[PDB]
Amino acid sequence: MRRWFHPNITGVEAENLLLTRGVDGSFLARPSKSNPGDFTLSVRRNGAVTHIKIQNTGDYYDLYGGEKFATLAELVQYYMEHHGQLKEKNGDVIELKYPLN
Numbered sequence: 001m002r003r004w005f006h007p008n009i010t011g012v013e014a015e016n017l018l019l020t021r022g023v024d025g026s027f028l029a030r031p032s033k034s035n036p037g038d039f040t041l042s043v044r045r046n047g048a049v050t051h052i053k054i055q056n057t058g059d060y061y062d063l064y065g066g067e068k069f070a071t072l073a074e075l076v077q078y079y080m081e082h083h084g085q086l087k088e089k090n091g092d093v094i095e096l097k098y099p100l101n
Contacts, residue, residue, distance in 0.1 A: 011040075
C-alpha cells in the first residue's frame with residue numbers, strides 16, 4: 001500500500017536509509033532517475049543494496065517481464081507474498097521482506 005514509497009529520495013539517500021536503518025530484506029520503492037515515469041525498488045541483501053527497475057507502460061506495471069499489475073502497490077504486495085518470484089539479473093532471487101518506512 002504506501003509507507004515504503006519514498007518520493008523524497010535519491011538512489012544514494014535510498015542506500016543511506018537502507019544501510020543505516022535497514023536490515024537484510026529491507027526495501028523501499030522510489031521514482032526512477034534512469035527513466036522518469038518508472039519507479040525503482042532498492043532492496044537490501046547481504047549487506048548491500050540492489051536497485052530493480054519497475055516499468056510503467058501506462059497500461060500496467062511490471063519488472064520488464066513477469067506478472068503484470070494495475071498498480072505499484074499491487075506489484076509490491078505480490079512479490080512480498082510470493083517469495084521465490086523476484087529475481088534480479090543472474091536469476092538471483094531477492095526477498096522483498098521488510099518495508100523501510
